[PDB]
Amino acid sequence: DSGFDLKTKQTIPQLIGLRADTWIALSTQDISSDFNSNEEEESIALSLMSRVSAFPDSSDFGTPAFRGMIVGGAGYYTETTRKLPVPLTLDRFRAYCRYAGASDGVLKPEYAVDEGDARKVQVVKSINNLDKSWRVRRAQWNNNLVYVEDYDTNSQFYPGQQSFYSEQGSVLKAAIVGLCVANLNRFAFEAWRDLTGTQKLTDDQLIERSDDAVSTRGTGAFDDRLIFTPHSEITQADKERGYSWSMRIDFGANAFRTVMDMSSVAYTREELANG
Amino acid sequence: MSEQITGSTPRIYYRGTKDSSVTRSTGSTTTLPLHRPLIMFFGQKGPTVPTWIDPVKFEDIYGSETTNLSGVYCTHSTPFIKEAIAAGNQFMALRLEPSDIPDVATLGLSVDWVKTKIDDYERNDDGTYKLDTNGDKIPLATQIDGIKFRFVLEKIETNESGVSQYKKRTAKAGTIGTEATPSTITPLADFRCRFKSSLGANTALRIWAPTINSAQAADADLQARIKSFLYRFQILTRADKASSPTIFETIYNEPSLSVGFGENLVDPQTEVVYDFVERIDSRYNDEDPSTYLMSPLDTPYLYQANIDSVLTAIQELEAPFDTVSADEDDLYQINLFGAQTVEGVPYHAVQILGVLDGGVTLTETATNYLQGGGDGTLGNDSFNAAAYAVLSNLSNNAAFNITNYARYPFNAFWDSGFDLKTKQTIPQLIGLRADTWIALSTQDISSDFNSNEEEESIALSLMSRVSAFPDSSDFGTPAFRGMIVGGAGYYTETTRKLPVPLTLDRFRAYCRYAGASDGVLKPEYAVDEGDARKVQVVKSINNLDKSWRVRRAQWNNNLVYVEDYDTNSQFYPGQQSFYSEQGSVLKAAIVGLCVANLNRFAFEAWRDLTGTQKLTDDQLIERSDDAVSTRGTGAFDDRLIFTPHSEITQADKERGYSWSMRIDFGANAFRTVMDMSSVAYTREELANG
């Protein structure tokens, strides 16, 4: 979302309902209007979350959707002399283009979107509402928004880049894992496209070739964010039907720690030096 | 002398002799020293939010009149600002304003416009030299139908609700030629001051239309190449209502600009833009943090519809006439403020009413000043009021939240003599922030010097206030980040009699010691050794004849006080902090600032490590310690010895998203008492045996 009005913002979420290999980034800003206040940010966030809740990941079991994220904030584009407002989705878009856009389909370790100089804002300035209160920041975090903070007097950084998954699962808490899963869903389609409609196959060859395809395509591509494993077979319902086979992927991921403590104790110089 | 650089023709141009011009000084990249103070003050211009500043640029960010002790902006913190600038501390400025400050200065331009028959004058030749009965000849034609103008420059009036009409002026009935109603005032442009101060009331502007004969000769080739008449624009500023103006040059060191009416006046031969507002705003301003300068004028506004209508009217009238081009695009060539083309041929059928007729003469010598504005009510009383307004409302201020560690790197606050009501809102800084340090004073600079009993009473009250913000709310450790300094005197670095407290002297000492931009304490300025332990910027201190009981009581109550070194000078027998317990680790005051810096280093470690997908527990733990030790080692000049330890305790295992750090540090104290005794010996039994 590059800044569509709120009427158009509410027709985008249906992509992650109509397709199983799609990933959406939403913006809480309308570039044709004034920079929003904290209350308007919260209201638009709630409205977008309500819209998104209508497209569960699994309709059979009602898994909450997790492919995408919502980013709040706005500023001015730095790569031009003119005055041209933009939302922070532009900065995240540039980061992702550099990270996961290589023509050879393997993630670049040198552009990790949350390590080094990629975790700071780079193409936006004069961001707004940077004096959020603790309660406002806590509310946004609990509503699963992605927001920036001040790094130093000159710049900003992302304390944590999470997706709009609403549950307590720690597997689906990073936004990049959603893109990885979308790619897995694409690989499964490729396997089917290759194996469909062949006269002389046997069931064992079909089952073996599906797993071979998915594993060969996926292994070595995700820069160690995921670990996955496919399994193809022919269940009893497939035996009954006679023209279908099943595949099922098992995958796992991690999360990230975000809180630190601080304490001190005063010693005399001698007992601290030796004792 | 007069003609300007038009092109590449071989030539040497002489710009005459001139007197020296002030040159704006370039600044350097900002850093974090160990001493990072916040200073609130009244100013002439500049932003009204906290700003991290390198002292080289204070003069040209906040105007050079704010540091003048004899000016109107002097308050009880100007000495602090001057000392900071002298020592070279990158510090955080906060410009306050009085609660009754007026709005900005404004000036609108308009033309009184009418049509009527007028006279016509003789002509010597096609040059159309003759005018106004020059020579000996009466005007020739009986009556020539034409147009009458009368220019007006005046303040832009506000709405009845109290809102300016900066962009919302409208035409009205005129006054010249009232025999015909259509005499109308129509607006042409608006100008507004950028800041809220007397600088706007003293700012002035000039606009004129030159010809080939001017002191700044124009060129017809450029106007032919891009069809638009070029006007000269100039900005001036004066010191006070009685002084004389001085030209405010552009960032390229020029006295005036050439501008023109139209959409985009781009020159193909050189790619230069002659648009009015764009050119003015781009040439007179410079926002680069290292070379920073803002023009007193804001961005001009222009009434395109009305200017276009008047140009169209005059073109339709006289463009198809004897001595003016009739083409369509000549509309923007039409000379409006003058009455002639670039070559200097007068427009007959146009009459501009002069001064005696109630008009304004737009020439290079006329000057026009913005109307309105002001600074407000200045002085120590209003300064204290504003400071209290800011300090009391810290948890719900809509201007800025100062619990933001990353955005507001200040770590010290010195009491320069605020009144007792404002004094009691300062201690909460070391309650709201864990990397802050405060110095307090027992003297209200606007009152008479306190006596011994008043000193004691104020000290007790401040201690009681400080007792409400313990360092560790969990275990109730008493606060130790700061100190209280008692005494007052007079400032020595000026002829005027200007009382100041001794917090100023200790402020200068700390600035010199812990103010290096590379973040390392300077051993040659140790605040308690050599010549830095004497009073240097205060004289005629009071209550120097304290009795032994009074001195003992003050020491027990944890004040910092001075004594007589010799017949001429004073010194500090011991500079302790307001820690109220018996521990000898936290007895010195500089150690408190060292500990504040340690707390800052912890925040930096967190900021760098937070929120990473692919880290492990061991790497997180190791990197935290690496950061803290690498940052802090070798900077505290042997005042402290510290050691960090990160880990993931059982509570962290439960939570799954947190890790812990703990720093162990140790320090020393000082001796203050000596005994004395003697024994008498005979010369022999003393010399041998």
Numbering used by the authors:
A (entry chain A): 415 to 689
B (entry chain L): 1 to 689
Study authors write:
The Klebsiella jumbo myophage ϕKp24 displays an unusually complex arrangement of tail fibers interacting with a host cell. We observe the tail fibers are branched and rearranged dramatically upon cell surface attachment. This complex configuration involves fourteen putative tail fibers with depolymerase activity that provide ϕKp24 with the ability to infect a broad panel of capsular polysaccharide (CPS) types of Klebsiella pneumoniae. In this study, we combine cryo-electron microscopy methods, protein structure prediction methods, molecular simulations, microbiological and machine learning approaches to explore the capsid, tail, and tail fibers of ϕKp24. We determine the structure of the capsid and tail at 4.1 Å and 3.0 Å resolution.
After classification, polishing, and 3D refinement, the tail structure (EMD-14357) in its extended conformation was determined to a resolution of 3.0 Å in Relion13. The outer sheath component (light blue) is located at the tip of the sheath monomer, pointing outwards. The central sheath is essential in sheath assembly and contraction. To facilitate the interactions between tail sheath proteins in the tail, the two long extensions from the central sheath (the N-terminal extension, residues M1—S21; the C-terminal extension, residues A667—G689) can connect to the C-terminal domains of two adjacent gp118 proteins located in the ring below. Additionally, the C-terminal domain can connect with two adjacent sheath proteins located in the upper ring.
